[PDB]
Each structure stands twice: as structure tokens, then as C-alpha cells.
Amino acid sequence: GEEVVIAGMSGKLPESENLQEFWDNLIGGVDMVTDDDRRWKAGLYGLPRRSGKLKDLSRFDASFFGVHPKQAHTMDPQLRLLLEVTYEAIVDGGINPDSLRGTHTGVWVGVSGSETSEALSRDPETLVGYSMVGCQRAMMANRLSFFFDFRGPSIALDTACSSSLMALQNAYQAIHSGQCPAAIVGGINVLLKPNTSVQFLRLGMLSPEGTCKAFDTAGNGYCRSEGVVAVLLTKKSLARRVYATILNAGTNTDGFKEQGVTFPSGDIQEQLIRSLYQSAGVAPESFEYIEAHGTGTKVGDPQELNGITRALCATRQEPLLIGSTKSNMGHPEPASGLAALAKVLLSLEHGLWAPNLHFHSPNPEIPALLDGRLQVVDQPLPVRGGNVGINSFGFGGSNVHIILRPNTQPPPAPAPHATLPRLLRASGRTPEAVQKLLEQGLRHSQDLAFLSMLNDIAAVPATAMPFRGYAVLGGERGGPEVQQVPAGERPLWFICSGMGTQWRGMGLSLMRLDRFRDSILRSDEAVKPFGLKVSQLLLSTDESTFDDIVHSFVSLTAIQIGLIDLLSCMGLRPDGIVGHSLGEVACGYADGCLSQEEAVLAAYWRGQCIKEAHLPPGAMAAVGLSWEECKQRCPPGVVPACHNSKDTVTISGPQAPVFEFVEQLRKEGVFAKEVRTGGMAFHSYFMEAIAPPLLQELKKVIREPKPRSARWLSTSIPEAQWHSSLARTSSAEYNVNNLVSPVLFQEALWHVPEHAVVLEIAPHALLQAVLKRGLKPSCTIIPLMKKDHRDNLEFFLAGIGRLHLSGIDANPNALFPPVEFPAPRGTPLISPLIKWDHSLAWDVPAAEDFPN
Amino acid sequence: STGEEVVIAGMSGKLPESENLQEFWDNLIGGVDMVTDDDRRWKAGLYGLPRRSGKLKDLSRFDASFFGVHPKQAHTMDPQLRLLLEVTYEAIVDGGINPDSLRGTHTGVWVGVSGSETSEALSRDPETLVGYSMVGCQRAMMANRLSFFFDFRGPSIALDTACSSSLMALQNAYQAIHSGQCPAAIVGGINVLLKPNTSVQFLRLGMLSPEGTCKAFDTAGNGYCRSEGVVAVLLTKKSLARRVYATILNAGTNTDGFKEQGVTFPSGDIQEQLIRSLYQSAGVAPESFEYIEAHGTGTKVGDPQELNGITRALCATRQEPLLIGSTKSNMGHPEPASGLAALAKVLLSLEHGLWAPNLHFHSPNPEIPALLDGRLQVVDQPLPVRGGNVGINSFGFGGSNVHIILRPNTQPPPAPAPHATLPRLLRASGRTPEAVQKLLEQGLRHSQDLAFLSMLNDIAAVPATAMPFRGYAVLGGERGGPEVQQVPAGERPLWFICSGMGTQWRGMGLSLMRLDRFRDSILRSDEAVKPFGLKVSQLLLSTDESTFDDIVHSFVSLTAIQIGLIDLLSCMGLRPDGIVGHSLGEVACGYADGCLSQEEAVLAAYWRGQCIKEAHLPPGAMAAVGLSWEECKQRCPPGVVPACHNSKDTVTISGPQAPVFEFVEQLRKEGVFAKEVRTGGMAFHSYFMEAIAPPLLQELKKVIREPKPRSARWLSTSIPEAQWHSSLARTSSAEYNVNNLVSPVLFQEALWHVPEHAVVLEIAPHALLQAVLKRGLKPSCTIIPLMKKDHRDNLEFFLAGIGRLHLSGIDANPNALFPPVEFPAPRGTPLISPLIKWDHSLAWDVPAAEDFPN
């Protein structure tokens, strides 16, 4: 059938708020069983004082889960915690939960108690109906399917202690047979009602010392514990991270026993173990370690270990390692299987078997312990290699056993782009949630698989995760940037700049990105017939290279096209487009009116037709007065050419009168600065003589002009004329008319809506200040390249980071070569890095809420 | 070959106002509303609750000792579990399967359950609560306790998906059987209403109808009525089934996922996709459906969501209306067990050929176009079942949906056959005499239903320690009624006694010739003697009273009949623990022991007679004499001797005709019983036989070429005990048989070794030895005759003997005597589960409404 892997995990265990703390406690030999009065007075009714308790049951990020406060207070704490642990298990696997919505993903939850339901229905006069929706057993599974939008089976099951490993088994069968592509498996247990512990006490199942002395002579019962664990299983193809592959999972039941229903049968357990390795085609000698059910009972331990010995140790030359998580944290009953699984996977990820606590003298009823066929892990031991088995046996006789093949994927071989900086983006319910992801990303900045997975889980809408951040890794000038995301819809606008943005060496830093390089090489092919190569112009060390009009027009357009291609590969589509002068050629590419070759040829012919003609000497100057003021003050022959902002306009005309006016104006104290245009009066009647030959060349280039969309605001045609036949398409005529007409830039900027995110598409963000002045103050202005910057690749990635802060989604993973999956063993855990808004404290039943 | 074919093989249940499925059906087809308004569980109207709810008649009954539960544990067991254990046993036997045959198998158990109210009531007092209440009330035990008792080793799981739980259990068990993981499975659904607080929760959620009625599909639908239910179904792969109610063509589940309307808003679009995906994957056409059992809880929002989803899934291209019904309208909504309750209603409708109608349907919900246009037709009147697939929906309030497709079993009744006129034996076992009486009475009422009787006979082999009462009835016979008795405790060794001379009678065996196995045995014996101008079957048909006066005829015919009787006993698996033969009866003993083949035994009887005849000895005689053996010896005139030691005070003498006759006459004069035997005028077991020895030995050496050892089960009557370990007594050789003819019959001597409490069968065409056996055996022995001289119908007499064998605690299935019934049983074969009775005299604890917080 289908290969089944464990793709992600999370959990809350005794004295452990997450799996990292669980591991620290395990490998540190910390006893997680405690003796405080968290749940009820110590020794109440003669109960043992010790039990494994979660640090907190009151926390729940209710609004992220769409739960109203009234329902949150009346929801079983097991469910409140399982909703968050489930989310963490999914992202732990590097999967964005949104990608599983509407799928036939299944949910199986192992659960045996409904104490909250009892507490909440105790008063008929005051009880509320919605406590049934938050506490009824089926909801422990159904509420997950509801929130995550999972449509596969949704089942809560009870086989007592083996519940959660039985959920794992049923989930494995559903994936193996092709019924589900993925599944959530959960295990939950809380200790709210002291009466329940009294019942177990009187059955003789509880140790008076509240300890699971697994495999030890002194074993006399188990210590009750709490636990909330979730695991994400998927078919191999869907996994990003793989902790292990499930080779087989199976169940049987003891059936009739002369000793009674609660007497465990080692003979039946042994048959289960054997039938599973036989049917998986696995040899008993291939096992390195077995996680025994190991509750530390006088009858159960020998039954189980002697069954393991007969099933697995008959022909083994080496001892078989054996451990029990229950010796470290107590017995979380139905959640026991998944807690033991978490200890196993964490041991494998760290290369060390965590050891048992409380093992001093071998149970004398167990020969393999005295003879070395079984070896208890009572010291941390390196993981050497081999399959792992896990047992979970219920007190009613339901047995489950699973065989795992650990993922041993080695770290990747050093690669070229690994040296390039990378962008890491993060989202979170709070600033601390974001900070936590960026900090760990920084700490593992060379772990490409880890960063790739983090980048994949960050695309969560700002309405759900209001804080965002980024960090450019492997660069020079970087540190984490975090901010709350301004609420509302934020339209994305592209501004393509015109002349004055070229500089020696421009684009060379971005050439290290394959997509940008490939775009440039494609532009080279367009101009090859004209003896030009864009990549060679960019490599030129001659400061005068871009003084040549054709070099600068072609190189500018090529770079703009390369930047638009980087943005497109991340799925960005602008809501608005504005070009300045020659920038309209790249706007036509961005709007989808011009192909890459047409845009590049259009910039070539525009410059070449200028080169092939003679024009009288012209000049342009930035004047410190309004458009209206300019039209009245301009001397004869001089005209307003660019309406950049309210108080800054560019004039164009005959060289002398221009230099004169600049003089006159400076006389009257007005700002006047001659621009350098190489003796050209662009955007004036002066260009008129270029029109005819340019129109002839462009008609051959743009054979089938396409209509400009409403996103694209023309700067060469006044708004009053937007319905004209000339403004309809990006035709040879449209492009010729741009050259001889004024740039109505400020006019277009006025139509940019509030809260827009504006990117400057240019080799140097020349228009930043003009943009700030002409745009509504609620706009975010982002530059993508800077003249002479040490490393424009880093500057560009910071801008993509700023895009993320603004609430726009752009995954930087797409800019770099795809990481190979599954991730290497040891890729850092993600679930413990997830933080929620846990400021509120929700109702939790008290010991007195139950009958006494 | 997608996988294994899955069938519903048996069912049982306890539903509102219905102690079993027969009462459930009577209520359904009779239009009886099973929802009531009494104070059984709590003061009606308490907390403003609706007064009406579906309640089981009793929650206190449980045959604790059958299930090995001590009284202290029975009082602290959830009533759901106590009831489920019995309903599970009834579901298995309902299928005509003896539960013992599933012990140790990988049979699975899935139980749909949503409440543990008893567990709450029983753990309320920390000072007094006991630990074993956890073993009888924890949710996992609802499944685990069944696996434990029945010895099932497949998966054992309790599951909760709210309303759809029990149909989800059925889907999971269908998948485990279909994929080859389990050969069979028990599927259960349970719900009880003990805690009024629970109903308050639902009331406040707006889910309960103030009228306590599920007005399914009706404009007045405003919520559901809560009910109780305990249902169990046995699923098996096709090959294991005897009865088949229906084949499951497909079963599947999906979940609503996220809904803008909230978690409890039912999604018709998702339900519709489940229905479509299932008939598409089963290769079933939507037009092939006759009827659909809708979840139909009678809610304002749910009904149209469901029925409009059904319309889009199934009614797009249908030319005929699709029938729809809802069992909830009849008995309310038993929550997790609703899927199995609906299933019971469907299967009972199919078995009776009538769709049981809904109650409370007056005006169609106006938001459902197909009810207004006739594309969907509510069954509000009983309608005949016409043919086609059936679908069943069960949707949980949390969004878990289950749908199943069934193909009804339409197997017609069997074609009239010749053997169907023969009488049949019905055996029964039970916890009480009333349980046995109930099976025999129903068997009598359906005496021509072969499949029904065959299935009843298959469930009767239960040890006496578990079912202390047994009974039988010979059906289709002239006379005879039920025999019921408590089964005497202890091991009871089975002994075969093969009689000798004096048992022959004109027409013997003719009645048994109607049984194919007996007839076939006789025809085989005919072949052995055909070369000698004899045909056993023709001697049995002879109307000549002198036929058996010829010793060859009588020897051969007796042996053949005893062999035929041994063959009938062997086909039922009976193996004797002891064997004693009388005179020529020792030949059949050899066959029964295993040392003589049928042909050897028949040829041995032939030669014994023919060699005697061939010698033309002087006239001899034998006579049954009412004297002890010793008392006989001293009154035995010269030439006359004691030949057969039958009992303490009765012996057979043998000698010269003249002196035996004269001695017989003087005996009658002196008031003694003197009865001359029919011996072809010969003196058997006497010196007069000595001249026959040599030629007989020569013929027998050719017949018995390779003697075989005589088991220790076989006590010799021709060789004194002191010599039982000699070489002659070792094998059934030519010498052993020659010696039998020439030596006395030490019958009484052998009888002394028969142990106490033995069950003794007389293998003979006429049970001549009954009184001798009574006298010579310990008084604790049961003596059973198999044939009687001149009986009107020895087939009936033989079956009544097989019945007596059952009563004694020995197992012998009479089904093996008759042609095998073809399985699956015909549709309509009477239900068995309702016929099962238990020892329900005690009343066990049930929590009271006041045992919960108020």
C-alpha cells in the first residue's frame, strides 16, 4: 500500500510545556512526577501524594480558534489544549495547516475521561447547553475536524491505556490503504476528579509511592499522569520532515483469561509482536530498542517482558535495549502510547536514548534482565541503528504494537547558493511568537531545510496572526524586524522608474540569483542581433558605458524586467502599475501587454532612433514651482516635461533658454537645478522628429498590441483621454507618444488608494522621496535596489521582508533552489517554537465541583 | 476481487417497549408508538423536560452466572453492559452459529457508545465506592468485557462519534472483515437515560422536541425525542454465514469539516458526497435503490439538509420515486445506537416483505421540494418490499457521517423434496426449563422449515455446566411431544452394546432405509454378499415370516443392520468409550472398534452361518431359561449346557434338540420360564459347534487376512477376563471369531466393568437386552434402545433415542443424518434471537435519578 511516516509532533506533558522541555527533563533525568496540591489536597481520601501534572490547564488562544468566551469557559481543558497541540504538530512538520483544509485528512483521538462534562452538568437549574458542545467525548475529535476543516474519519476511541496507540494504528491503516492522505492522532488525559483515583486505588492499580518503577522488583502499581499529545501522519509523498516510517502497526485482544479481565496476557502480547514483524518482513535481530508498556506492576511487568523475550530474543546475539517513559513521567493512561512515541522520536532526533528513572534491582520474575538478553536503558546511550518497537496494552486486554524505521537522512553536502544570504519570514499571535522563530532561525542560519520549512508556515493571514517579522540571514547588515500588521486590505502597486537610475555595476549582485540571471540572459538574446549583450554592459568597468543612450535604455528595462520576474516567481500580482517615462515599457511587461522580447526591443529602438538622428542641443531642469505656475512662467520654446510632485517639476527645451530660465529663476530665489540628459530635451516637442522613424521600427516590434488593464495608470496620456483609441493598447503609437509627451506622474500617484504597498521597480530607487510626497500618508514605500550598495541581493531581500511586514504574502523560498525533502534527521523541532496569546485564564473544574 | 464479501449474519436487541426484536417488529408493523410518558427513569416533567422518551422495559435483568459475574460485580456493572452481553449472545445464535466455535478466533468487537452515567453514579462516594465498579462501567469495558467473555482476539474498541457511533462501529467492522483482518465481528450500539441532567443539556441546546416526538420529514418537526437502545449485530465473511439478512455492498464515512453555520449545523452537501462516493465505488446505480433509511430526527434544519442531499445524490435520473423512512418516528432517537436500531428496522422489514411505516407524518416539510414533487416518497403506510438496494444514513451532531449500502438476501424457500417428508429430530439446550420449552415449541410451530430446525440444532451443543437444561422433540412424526430435563452432572462414558440372536424380525430396518446413510450402508453390505446369491436389502423386504429362520439370512441381516446403526452414530461424531457384544454381536463390535472393515464383518457373519449349514449337524436347540447360571447347571440333563450368562437370574442353555425341548417342557411344568430361541435348529456356544471350527477357521482366514488389535474399549464376552491379556484376545482374527461361536457368552461378566453414570446404547434391530442390561449395570447407567420390533416407525424411535442421548449430556447433531440444508437460509426463516431465554429471576442494581447531582 502507501508508505506512512510520522511527519510532525507536539505535546504538553508533566512539568513540560512543550516537547523541548519534555526532552530536557528526559535527558536530564528530571522526575516529572510531583507532589503538590495542584489538582487536590495531598493525600485526600488516602490517595498517593505523587502524580504527573501539566503545568497549566487554563490557557487557550480562544480567538485564534474562533471560540467565543462563553464556550471557551465551558470547553473541556483537554480539548482546548488539543486544539493548540494539533496546530503545533502540523506546523512542526513544516506544513501550513491551510493546505490540508477540505482534504480527506482523518482524526483519531485516544481518550478515556469526561470529568469536565460531569462537573458542568451538575446543576440542572444553571447548566448551559453549550457545555455539551465543548465536553462530549466525540467532540475531542469532531472539534478538531471542524476547526482544521478535515473531512476524513473523525473518531474518539477508548481502549483504556492503549487508546492513543490504537488511534495511531487506525490512522496508519487509513493512510496505508489510501483512504486518507494524512491524519491527526491525539492522546489526552487530565486528573480533575479525585474519586477516579480512589477507584484505581481500590482496584490495587496505584503505587502508594506514586511511581512507575518499571522493570524493578519494587514495582507495585502505577502513578497517574496527565498528557496532551498529537502527531501528524502522512503518506510519504506529502511529508517535509520525517521522524520515522511506520513499518507496521497492529492490535489484538487477550480474550478469555482464567485470571480475570484485568490480568495481562504475555502470551497474547507475544503473538501480536511476532505477527507484526513477520507480516512486515522484519527480522527480530533488526530491532535496536523497544519501548515497553512498562507501568511497573508486579504482574504486568513480567508478563510483558517475558513475552518480549520469547517474541524477540530467541536467536539474538546482542542484548535488546528496553525502556519505559512511564518511569520518567508516570502513566498518562490513554495518552500513554503517544507520550512513549514522543520520548522515542526525541531520542532518535538527538542520537541518544533517554534513560529510565527508578531502576535499581531487576524484577526476579524476569530472566532476561538477570541474563543480559534484555538491557534496561538506565544511562543515556548513543543510538546505534535499527528498528524500534512500541507496546501499549490496555487494562481491559486491548493490545497495540507498532514497528518504526527511524529516518537516518544525513545532512546535505555543502552547496554553492548555501553561501548566498537567505530571507526568513515569520508570523505569530504575539511579538514574542515572532521573535522566537526569528531567533531560532538565526541560530540555525545554515540549515536550509529548517529555514525552508519556517518560511512555508509563515503565510497565515494577518487577521489570524497580527504580528510578523523577518531577518535576512548570512548577510552583513541585518537583525530581526518585528511589527504588528496594520489592519485592512493592502493593494500592491508597482512603480517603474525612468532615466537617472543607471549606475556602473548595477544588477551584478542580483545576477547570483538564477531567476534574475536567466531573465538577463533572455534579454541578451533579444539584443544580440544588434551587437549588444546586457550581461556584458552590467559587467563593464567603464564609467561611461551608460552615457550611451542605447546602453542605458536597454539595461534599465532589462533590470526592471528581471526584478518583475523575481516578484512574479513569488506569486505577486500587482493591483496597480505606474511608469515614469521609459518606465512605461516595463509597465507594459508587468501588465502582460508586452512580451520580454518586445519590451527590450522597444527600449532598444527608442534609444537607437535617437542615436541615428541629429537634434539641436537641449536641456532639462528641475524647477521648484507648480505645474500651473510653470505653464505661465516658461519662456518661449521651454515647456514643462515631468510633473513629479506638487512642488517639483522638470522643464525641457532649447539648451540656451533653459539655462537662462534656470538663471532667472535662481535670481528670484526659486529652486532650479539643471538635470543631466546628455544634451537632450526628453518629453517635449523636441523629440517630435524622432517619432516617425521610431514609429516605423516599433510597428515591426509590436505587431499585435494588447489592451492595457485598468490596473495600469498611464502617465503619458491625460486621464481625460483614457478612453481614446491611442490609450487602449500598448502599441507602437502608445510608446512613441510617451517619448514626446510630458510625464504626468503626480497625476497618477493621486489615484493610488489608501494603505497601498508600493514597490519601486528600478536599479536605484530614485523616486522614493517623490513617492512619499505624492502618495497618501498611509502608503508603504519599498525600494528594491540601491545605487552602489555593497550587496543589492541583501537589500532586495530586506524589501521582500518589508513586504511581509506589510501583510503581503511572498515566499522567498521560490527565489532559491528548492530544498530536497525529507529534511535530514536532527533538523530542529518547530512545535516548541510556537507561542500563543495566553493572557486569559479560562475555567477549569475544581476538585470540589465533584460529589464527595 | 476487491476483498472478502461481508454479510449481516445475526442480530438481536432491546428497544423501547420491546424486550426483543419480535416485539420490536410487532410494534413497528402495528403502528405502536414506543415513546411513552411514564416516570420510569425520573419524575416526568422534571426541570421542564419533555415528558416523553423511549425507554426499555427493564434494566435490572442479567443472567450473571452464565457470564461468570459474581453478584457484587453484577450490581456494579453498567446496565448497558449487562444487557449487551446477552444481546451479543443472542445475535450470534440468531445466525445459527454456536458461539463456542468463534472462541480463540480473531473476531473483532466495535461498540458505539456515548454515555457512562452509571460510572458517574457509582464513583460519587469516595468513602464507599468500590474498585470493581471501574471494571463494570468504564467505557472501554463495553467492548472489552465482550471480547473477554466470548474469547474474541480481534480488535476490541468502544467508539464515540455521537449519533453515528453504532453505524461507525459497523463501518469499521465491515472494513476489518473486507480486508481479511477479521473473519467475523460483533457490532454493538448502546444508550440508556439515567441522568436527567443530560436531557437538560440537550433541552438547552434546542435539540429536544417539547412534544417528545421525532416528527421526521413533517412541517411540525421541531427536535428529537431521546430514547434507549441495546442492539448487537454479527457480521461475518460470506463463507462463515448460515443466515444472511443482507450483504453489505459498501460502508463509508466522512466528516463535515468547517461550516460557517457552526459545528452542530448539519451539512447536506457533505452528506450528499458521501452517498455518491459510496455507490460509485461499489459500482451500484442510484436507480437500483428501493428504499433509504434517513437519519431523520425531525429537526427543522436537519431534515431538509439531509433530504435535499439525498435528492441530489440519488434522485437526479430516477424515473420512480425513492421510498424513505425513519425509525426515530416510531421509537425516538437512541443516539449512538440509532444506526443499529434503524438497521434492525430495515432487516425486519425485508424479512417480512413489508416496509414498516413512519408515525407522525402528516404534512411534508415545505423546504423539501422532492417530498412535494413525489421524487421522495415517505413510507407512512405499510408497503410491500418490491426489490432493490437499501441505503442507511447516520449523522452525528459533531459532523461525523456514516452511510451503508445493503443488498437484501432474496433466497427463495427450498424446492419440495422427498426427504422433507421424513420426521426430524430437534434438540435444545437452555439456562432454564422455560428456555428449552420455548425452542421446542417454536420448532414444533415451524416443523416443515428445514433451515430453521437445522440452525436450532447447531446452537444446542452447549455444555451442561453452562446450560443445565436440555430437551428434544421428534417433529413430523405420528406421536411424541417435548422431553425436557435437567442434565445430571459429571462425565458420562458412552458404551455400545451389540446384541446377538433373537433380535431378528420380519421387516426389520425398512423404516431406517429412508435415511440415505443407513440405506447406503445396507447397499454396501449387499455388495459383500452378492457373490453368494444374497441381497440384504431383499431379505429386509421379504414378507415371508420364515426368512430369518435360515441362519445365513439372520446372521448376515443382523450384522448389516448393526453396521448401518454404527454408521448413523459415527456420522454424528459419536465414538464409544466402551464396547460389549453378545455372541454374533461381537462381529459388529469389531467393526465398531475399528478392527474389521464392513466387508470383513459381513463376510464373517456369512461364513459363520454357511459353514454351520454346510455341516448338516444333528438337530440342536437353545432356550431362554428363567434361572441363574449355577442353578441351571445342576438341573441341566446330560448333553445340555449353559451357553449364555445373560444376568444373575437368567441364562440361555444349549444342546441336543430332544433333551432341550423336554427340559423346556419340564421347566414350564415346574413353573420356570423356558423360552426356545430361533436358531435354525442349531446348538450355538456349545460342544456341538466344535465340528464347525475347522472349516469355519479356513474360510475366515481368507476373509480376515491381516488381524487388527482390539482396543481396550472392547470388553470380550467370548474370553474370560482372566485371559483378556492373552494372545487370542489381542486381535479380531479368524481364531477369535471361531472361538466366539464355540464358547459360552460371558455377558454378565463384562457388564460388571461398565462404569457408573455410563450412557449405554443397544445396537440391535430390536432392543432385546434392555432388561438384562438394567439388571447387570450399575443403577446410575442410562440405557437407550435404538430400534423396536414391529414398531410403526423405527426412524422416529431411533431419533427419540438420539434425543435421549442429547438429554444425557452427550453431543450428537441429528443434522448429519439428513441431506445438508443449503446455506444461506431462505429469506423469511424465523428469527432465533427472540427465542433465547435466560435465568432472569434476580433484580440487579440500576442507578436512580437521585443518585446524580441536582
Ligand SMILES: [Cl-]
Ligand atoms: Cl467405524
